[PDB]
Amino acid sequence: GPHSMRYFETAVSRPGLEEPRYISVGYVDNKEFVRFDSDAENPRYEPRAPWMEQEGPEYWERETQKAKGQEQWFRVSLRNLLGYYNQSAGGSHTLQQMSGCDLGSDWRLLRGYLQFAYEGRDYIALNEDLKTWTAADMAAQITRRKWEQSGAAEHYKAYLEGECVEWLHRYLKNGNLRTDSPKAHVTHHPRSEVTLRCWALGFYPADITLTWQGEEMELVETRPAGDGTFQKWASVVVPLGKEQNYTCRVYHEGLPEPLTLRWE
């Protein structure tokens, strides 16, 4: 199966605060594994899953200094951006980064990622070639030119193809993957006509499809139960007496094949 690593980083400035708040979250296979928060009493990268406790003290020391370096980088970048957009003092501002790698089932690099947002909107991104930059904003051209002239892309490329892949291999070995199939049931709610609501519960990961049918409806967005698993439902308003004409189908990666269900 395929694999991935991501670091999602955020710095926020506020009218009062002397220094921005910086938060970094690391993910392996879309599951949080490390976290740094500058608001902590003694800010350090901390493990977020049990399998990371295997890493010794020098690992945490190095990563913590990386994060403190990022915190400085974000502080300076936030200041530079304020200038680029002619934003005055007295506002709140946000700078975000996503970076990392996707591996195929063979554990080889499929794609590197490096994108940034200012005020929640795309600012600059490293293209899939890992050599050139896309920047929409006129203000972002200043940064694009600066990074073209400094050769920033070659260095990010080296990280993405080297370190990102190599350390993801090490984390997949130490973390040795699993999924939880959805348990489904249909509820019955008489109204004017009855609402049949098909429930999917206890599943992981969150990606799932629910359909009602012969031929292909209200729903909710997939939501966390709070215990590591997810929930979803879909409903249809259906004639009283004729509820057996309708069948709910649940598609999830953990299923040997799609579940088919009806009101019983």
């Binding site: 370096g69 990022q70 300076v76 530079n80 980064q97």
Partner: peptide, 9 residues
């Protein structure tokens, strides 16, 4: 393995 950025914006 956290990324360490290069040139500032």
């Amino acid at each position: 393995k956290a990324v360490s950025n290069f040139a500032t914006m």
